[PDB]
């Protein structure tokens, strides 16, 4: 969740 | 300053939605030397993540503008020149993001999955520079983030659940590298179908991760059926 | 530098959303001392209203977290801090815009339609200026607000239409000063539903323009409902 | 338009 967010996903 | 007041204004400028600051925060807490928790570190993630994409969004819009203005040479020049400026920050971002990498947290990396998270930022940092490369270092700036990558994605391959978020956002990005910069589209398919079978393959997770990890993978699918038309 | 040349920066600004480079740009643009086309003024408000806009809204957030910390004195006072560095840049570039006003936008103004602009603008500055004001200044403060507003409605009543957009943005925004800042709904219901009532007696207009002063309208109606209970 | 952004309306 902040995880999901810091993993700075690409499209 | 102290460690846990610099952690606190960074908490405080993301709910401010105010990214620069929170960076700048959590870089001069990274720069103290400790290793950084979970909580620490996705911060400085989350941080650096919004900072470096509104300049790849505001650079993206700008070079469109410089494209479609060939050749009115004097709009064309304002555009360019804008383009630099904001290329000049996206550099300087990514050149800090690559040295706090290489100075402090991949050094200190003391867990597999803190390993392969920063190791995953450092293939992101150097793709965000080949997105803007000049033809002259371009070669070695790919070279350097894919190389990045690939040494996380092995590491996380030994080392964590194929349906861990930070391995399937690792495998979403190595293979976003792939089409996106090198333009192998197959390399890319085949990366991504493959971390997403080998997921599926162990899908027994529990309700919350099980939620980012198929969001994740629902992202690779997305990914996937696009790229085969 | 070349005026046109700051201008499309303005706009290469804008299409990039850095509002911050766009209000430099235009700020520029105002201190060469001509008047303003309404396209670059236009652009002047859009960058500054975003550039002050940010920080309104990263205030609000960050004062908030401060009043829910008392009275853990730590915490409260990383909030604070945080919320002070915000209004030190609220305050900095509220005075900017109020100098521009003063010094170049009011003084030139040419046409009824751009005084009027112009003095809803000082209003509005005053206003957010209001919003944040330290005690012993407040009170100056809200009556340059409100003497702004006044002057500015007194010319849009003699020499604009009800339906102007200029004169109704102007209505609403004079209405949410009362109601916000000198916390008077009485006022402020009855400054909207005037307004509202003026542009209805007159609706004529075109299909575009008859479109800005609806959706004008409908934010005074939304905001009368909403004041009534 | 470009003039309803300009004119900062309130909420």
Same mark, same amino acid.
């Given at each position: ?11 | ?38 909580? #620490? ?7 650096? /993540? ?33 383009? #630099? ?52 270092? /371009? ?53 991504? /179908? ?36």
């Amino acid at each position: 969740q902040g995880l999901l967010d810091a993993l700075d996903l690409a499209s | 300053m102290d460690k846990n007041e610099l952690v606190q204004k960074a908490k405080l400028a993301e709910q401010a939605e105010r990214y620069d600051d929170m960076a700048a925060c959590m870089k001069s807490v990274t720069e103290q030397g400790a290793e950084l928790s979970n909580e #620490e570190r996705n911060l400085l993630s989350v941080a650096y /993540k919004n900072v470096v994409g509104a300049r790849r969004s505001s650079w993206r819009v700008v070079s469109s503008i410089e494209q479609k203005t060939e050749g009115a040479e004097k709009k064309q020049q304002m555009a360019r020149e804008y383009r #630099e400026k904001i290329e000049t920050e996206l550099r300087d971002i990514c050149n800090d993001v690559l040295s706090l990498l290489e100075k402090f947290l991949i050094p200190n990396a003391s867990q597999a999955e803190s390993k392969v998270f920063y190791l995953k930022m450092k293939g992101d940092y150097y793709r965000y520079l080949a997105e803007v490369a000049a033809g002259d270092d /371009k070669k070695g700036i790919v070279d350097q983030s894919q190389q990045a990558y690939q040494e996380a994605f092995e590491i996380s391959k030994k080392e964590m659940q194929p349906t861990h978020p930070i391995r399937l956002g690792l495998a979403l990005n190595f293979s976003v590298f792939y089409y996106e910069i090198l333009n192998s589209p197959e390399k890319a398919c085949s990366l991504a /179908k493959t971390a997403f079978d080998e997921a599926i393959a162990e899908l027994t997770l529990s309700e919350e991760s099980y939620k980012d990890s198929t969001l994740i993978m629902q992202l690779l699918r997305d990914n996937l059926t696009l790229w085969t038309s």
